[model samples]
Target chain A: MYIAIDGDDVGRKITSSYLSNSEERLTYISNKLNDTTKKISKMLLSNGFEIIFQAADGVTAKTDNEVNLNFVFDKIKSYSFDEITFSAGVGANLREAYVALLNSKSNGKNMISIYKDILE
Target chain B: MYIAIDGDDVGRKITSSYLSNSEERLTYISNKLNDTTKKISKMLLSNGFEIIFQAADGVTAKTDNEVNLNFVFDKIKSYSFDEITFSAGVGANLREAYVALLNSKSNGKNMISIYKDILE
Candidate 1:
């Protein structure tokens, strides 16, 4: 399975506060993301998975064979700075699973999408 | 900061289970790790951290700025297959944080260690 977690509206939320200055807020946002990215990467590593951390863009990890998708999705939503949405597809391999999510190579293949709102 | 997550005693447990055998169990254990490692990498990536995945030895990722160490530690313990240990250090760069973990950087930096026992 391949899970793509995207932080929704983070850029706007982070900037809308803290003086609402684009330049200063952008710096703050960048720093927040940098630290968050690194910390999440390490955290996931401890969870017994390989990790890739990218600032603002989001993080990535592959599962061994199985995972309770709900358990994972909720965990990150609880920790993230804003809302998040994820799409996962199961297939013979990583490429196949992710492509399935992208709506290619297959259709309607046990794919899941979840969106969590911060206020809710 | 850099974190190195090592799955201790995993190679033995997964194998020792299905059969009290070596060769066949090793093959099974290897496959277990292969999928686990890949899934973790993608999972962490979704968390917004850059990640790197490997087998048997360990998984690695660099943090952006910060993490709740205890929060991360407990999360992984809940998911991992067996005992796991980690060493992390904070420095000007990944090398320094990891070296701090290696006990080579400014001695006694803000370093942490976590070991979880599956049975306990």
Candidate 2:
């Protein structure tokens, strides 16, 4: 299966305070995201997934084995802080997975959607 | 202006090494990306750009004032290590910028594309 994950409200969060804020605050936010991406990548690694890429508050991964979605979602949510939540999608391939991810983003934010469900 | 960046051939670099390699190697690659991303984000911040997001070897940013593209491209190329090159795009808006990015990826990776050039 393929998976895609992206951060919600990340644009507003960064761009809004950027001009009025100091570099230190922006660095702090950037570092938080860096750490969050690391942890999430590691989690997927442990779960038998091979990451296609994980940077800039986004991740795309794949694995031959299936895993528990609830546990994965819980862990993904746990990695979030500072009002930065994540939206995730799962599907049979990269295109479908990314489409599901877009669906998740459109349905609201911070929700998980499956391509199969969308098809059905 | 708005800019976008993404790693060139990042998927093959990771997935090919994985499965047959040790987790330590994978961790090293991940950390390299983490560091590369942080430095890139910092450089953009220094240049007066506010990042829309930076993750998974991708960055989207905007600034009111324009800077020298040659200098920016040189710095972006320098930040790339371990054979990981990057593709970049610039435009008047996000959608156009992303289209330019796709053009870069297609014309050949590790190059920069401008949306206006694409239009003309």
Candidate 3:
């Protein structure tokens, strides 16, 4: 009935600078992340999802259905990130959906985590 | 919104027996079609889609969301068809969905035809 997408790890990954990584690289990375987030947000909204919350790190949307969700997923997969960790949660309501997202995060890292309610 | 997937042309392609083609090919094609239908139906339903109709050539499902429709589309594309002609029509209701499906057929011959209501 509902779904959630997490973009937290990306913040950590993008901010931690390395000796080899120059300002240009970080700028590119930041810009890429922003571009990706904007594209994904626009895509999900265009597909009829409502934006519950969004920030520099991530976005949580109220999905109307899986069709748009899948569309968003497919779009997300097209982007390659630097240790960008993402997760998914699905539930009957918002709280459960966030719980699923939390579960997905605790369950793994650096990937698209889909919270399967019962049987996948 | 509702979406319709057209599977009629596959029937036309599978039945027209070629002189050089053996019964094994036709049987294989038929079996493949059946298997694809079953798999797609199962996947769509698992993702919350309701089956409206299905036959040897294709399956029509009432998608609860674009996620499942996208899932079904992704699954269908994974299969290699000799000559599978598919189309899509999306509408506010069943009639419009069917009409879109019909329009998809008239608009093109082969490939995935998605009936866009207004904008992509």
Candidate 4:
């Protein structure tokens, strides 16, 4: 299996805000993310899952959010993966999630899941 | 004023996690950060403040968190900023914050403020 994670504009904003100050907190968050990634990667690796790629989205213009989302979805669909999971929030519009699910169905992949914070 | 945002280890980790899995969210987050940065930058610029640079700290080893924080502090103090503001959380330790405050006093700067999450 292969997995990929991405954050939308809003998520990036909150994250940047969270990281903008305080070295101690910055260090703490960095470690937590690394450890989490490692644990997940290790579990998947143990199960023969490979991490094909990982990247964060760059800044998006207000007029281009939908277009960008489609582009990303196309990129994911263009690849072959046994499983794909997504964490959504920060600045992601809810409609985009619906579009992603629809795309997943059309792509014939059933191992897609979405994670979102309760507040979102 | 010169402002620097550094995310220690844990903050980096959370940010990475947030950015890894969803395109919609990723794009959203990215834009938010850019917008926020621009707003803050503009505000400062209007006040005759210039943004010299901005960067996030990288991964830190478990044994080296304290050391890394000091290095970052030194970097901050090395420069001269009329005001310095920090948004801390994610994985920053408390002691590191204390050190930053103390450093501010020693450096002859009186416009430093620390922000943290209530939960943290």
Task: Name the regions of candidate 2 deviating beyond 4 angstroms.
Answer: B1-120
Candidate 2 overall lDDT versus native? 0.78
Instruction: Point out the higher-scoring one by lDDT: 1 or 3.
Output: 3
Q: Which ten residues in a row have the lowest lDDT in candidate 1 chain A?
A: A110-119
Instruction: Considering only chain B, report the TM-score of each candidate against the true chain B.
Output: 0.55, 0.94, 0.71, 0.37
Q: Of the candidates shown, which would achieve the greatest lDDT relative to the real structure?
A: 2
Models sorted by TM-score, best on top:
2, 3, 1, 4
**Each model's iRMS:** 14.7, 8.8, 25.6, 9.7
Off by over 4 Å in 1: A11-20, A82-92, A96-120, B1-120
Off-target runs (Cα >4 Å) in candidate 4 are A6-21, A54-120, B1-120
* Per-candidate interface DockQ score: 0.02, 0.13, 0.01, 0.07
Q: B41-73, model 2: which lDDT tens digit per residue?
A: 789999989977665566677889778888887
lDDT, residue A54, model 2: 75
What is the DockQ of the complex in model 4? 0.07
The lowest-lDDT stretch of 10 consecutive residues in candidate 2 chain B is: B15-24
- Residue pairs in collision within model 2: A54-B56, A55-B55, A55-B56, A56-B54, A56-B55, A56-B56, A57-B55
Query: Which number leads on DockQ?
Result: 2
Pitting candidate 1 against candidate 4, the one with the higher TM-score is: 1
Question: Of 1 and 3, which scores higher on DockQ?
Answer: 1
Model 4 lDDT tens row, B1-120: 123333222233334433464435544433344344444444434444334322222111122212343434334333322223333212333333333433443444423333242224
Please rank every candidate by DockQ, starting with the best: 2, 4, 1, 3
Worst 10-residue stretch by lDDT in candidate 1 chain B? B110-119
